[PDB]
From Swiss-Prot:
Residue positions, PTM Phosphoserine: S152, S328, S361
Keywords assigned: Acetylation, ATP-binding, Autophagy, Cell membrane, Chaperone, Cytoplasm, Hydrolase, Isopeptide bond, Lysosome, Membrane, Methylation, mRNA processing, mRNA splicing, Nucleotide-binding, Nucleus, Phosphoprotein, Repressor, Spliceosome, Stress response, Transcription, Transcription regulation, Ubl conjugation
Family statement: Belongs to the heat shock protein 70 family.
Keyword Transferase: no
Span of the entire protein shown here: 2 to 383 of 650
Organ and tissue specificity: Ubiquitous.
Predominant location category: cytoplasm
Name of the protein described by the UniProt record: Heat shock cognate 71 kDa protein
Designated gene of the protein: HSPA8
Role description: Molecular chaperone implicated in a wide variety of cellular processes, including protection of the proteome from stress, folding and transport of newly synthesized polypeptides, chaperone-mediated autophagy, activation of proteolysis of misfolded proteins, formation and dissociation of protein complexes, and antigen presentation. Plays a pivotal role in the protein quality control system, ensuring the correct folding of proteins, the re-folding of misfolded proteins and controlling the targeting of proteins for subsequent degradation.
Length: 382
């Protein structure tokens, strides 16, 4: 009831914050000038880095750079999802009373935090970004969560807010927030079916909502928890490792530093390919002392990922199946997640839906935060 509440999207790879400032929702850019900040936290001898600064030093400090906390939040150390994921994280995950705790080293001192504490740090960064832009203290907010999150996961998220000093007015589902973003919540005096296609950094979520009277009903969901942007980056990486080996006769595969730098260059090239037909990869002193100057073409990129792009439609086909609906019954198709900006993914979706127009006027990566910001405003007054 003082200072507008903010809408915060807390994603597994990137987070975003927006505020309904008098009439419109303005999505707040950070200190580095980005509209989304990695959900990365890093611990060094002299400091605690959050956001871009953390992600930008990962290759150097892998064991003390935390990410993927959302895959742990509200879970028990003993569950199979945790057990499986742990086998691919550079950081340490320990067990405390059946609860996972990320073990790290901060200033020589060994520490460990609960997933909700890692997330609250990301939340503090968003709140900072907001307060910076507005020139006032931000207390109230609406935080989003996946539709499949159970009661434990939802509480852990609320707690993350409380720790960060936030008054969580409400916790809403991500697909619902995307729908509100486009005003699909307005009462049209009829039942409406909407398909949210969310392809972000590490997960793929497909949801079919049914809206009537402004009341949402998640009729079905599908997707893959280990399918996202990073999978595309990795295919390019494997492609360049082989080319470097060809041109230089030496395999850099096992150099954890070279690989992470290449990977960083690839993800940057991938972003460019969404708007251009080719991009250049210039990495000084890639392996030992050799500079890796080269380029990729959009055509080659799609080719390296063809199988992954097509597979994307199976979960969709299944979503329809479970909701007992046919393609023709979908009123609106909303694109969400930074990966839906890839031209070939959009094509594949339209083709499947026989030309239907996709909702994509709001950056797909900012859609969830956009919806949460509208929601927050209405739950306030101004
Ligand atoms: N222009 C772009 N083209 C392709 N991928 C992009 C683009 N912009 C962002 N991305 C990707 O979006 C992913 C992040 O998606 P986002 O929806 O912001 O993440 P999250 O799944 O964490 O919510 C990353 O893989 C990033 O590379
Ligand atoms: Mg997301």
């Amino acid at each position: 009831s003082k200072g507008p509440a903010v809408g915060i999207d807390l994603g597994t790879t990137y987070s975003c914050v927006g505020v309904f400032q008098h009439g419109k929702v303005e999505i707040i850019a950070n200190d580095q000038g980005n509209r989304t900040t990695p959900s990365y936290v890093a611990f060094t001898d002299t400091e605690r880095l959050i956001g871009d600064a953390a992600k930008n030093q990962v290759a150097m400090n892998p064991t003390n750079t935390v990410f993927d906390a959302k895959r742990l939040i509200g879970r028990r150390f003993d569950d199979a999802v945790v057990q499986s994921d742990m086998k691919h994280w550079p950081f340490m995950v320990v067990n405390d009373a059946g609860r996972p705790k990320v073990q790290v080293e901060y200033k020589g001192e060994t520490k460990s935090f609960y997933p909700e504490e890692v997330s609250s740090m990301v939340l503090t960064k968003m709140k900072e970004i907001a307060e910076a832009y507005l020139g006032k203290t931000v207390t109230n907010a609406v935080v989003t969560v996946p539709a499949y999150f159970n009661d434990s996961q939802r509480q852990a998220t609320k707690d993350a807010g409380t720790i960060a000093g936030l008054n969580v007015l409400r916790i809403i589902n991500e697909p619902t927030a995307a729908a509100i973003a486009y005003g699909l919540d307005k009462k049209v005096g009829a039942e409406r079916n909407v398909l949210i296609f969310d392809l972000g950094g590490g997960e793929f979520d497909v949801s079919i909502l049914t809206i009537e009277d402004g009341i949402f009903e998640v009729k079905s969901t599908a997707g893959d928890t280990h399918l996202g942007g990073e999978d595309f980056d990795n295919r390019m990486v494997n492609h360049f490792i082989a080319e470097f080996k060809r041109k230089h006769k030496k395999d850099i595969s096992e150099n954890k530093r070279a690989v992470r730098r290449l990977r960083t260059a690839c993800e940057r090239a991938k972003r460019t390919l969404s708007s251009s037909t080719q991009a250049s990869i210039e990495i000084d002193s890639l392996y030992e002392g050799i500079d890796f100057y080269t380029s990729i073409t959009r055509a080659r990129f799609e080719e390296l990922n063809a199988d992954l792009f097509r597979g994307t439609l199976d979960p969709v086909e299944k979503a329809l199946r479970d909701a007992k609906l046919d393609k023709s019954q979908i009123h609106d198709i909303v694109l969400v997640g930074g990966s839906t900006r890839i031209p070939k993914i959009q094509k594949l979706l339209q083709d499947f839906f026989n030309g239907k127009e996709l909702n994509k006027s709001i950056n797909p990566d900012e859609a969830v935060a956009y919806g949460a910001a509208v929601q927050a405003a209405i739950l306030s007054g101004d």
